[PDB]
Every structure is written in structure tokens, then in C-alpha cells.
Amino acid sequence: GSGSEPAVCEMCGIVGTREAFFSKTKRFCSVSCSRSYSSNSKK
């Protein structure tokens, strides 16, 4: 977590830089992907 760590989306797969991905969790490119992976799946 310094320069621009990559955060891959478990839902869509899209990968980006922490400062570009959802700061909330960072695991998903969007909050929807969070409520979706949670309300539609489990890990």
C-alpha cells in the first residue's frame, strides 16, 4: 500500500490501483459488486 497496489475485483475481475478502486473495501470496483457478492454469493 504505497505506490499503487493492484486491487482485483472478485466479481468482474477488473484490476486497478487502490486510489482508483472503491476505497470502502477495495476488493470490488463498486459497492454493488459488494452487495452482489454478499447477497448473491459467499467466500
- Which residues define the annotated binding site for Zn(2+)? 9, 12, 29, 33
- Beta partners for residue 8, in sequence order: 15
Q: Among all residues, whose Cβ is closest to Zn ion? A: 12
Q: Does 33 bind Zn ion (CB under 5 A)?
A: yes
The one-character DSSP state at 18 is T
Number of residues that bind Zn ion (CB under 5 A): 6
Q: Does 7 bind Zn ion (CB under 5 A)?
A: no
Task: Spell out where 1-43 has E strands.
Answer: 6-8, 15-17
The stretches of the chain forming alpha helices (DSSP H) are: 31-39
**Min. distance of Cβ 1 from Zn ion in angstroms?**
20
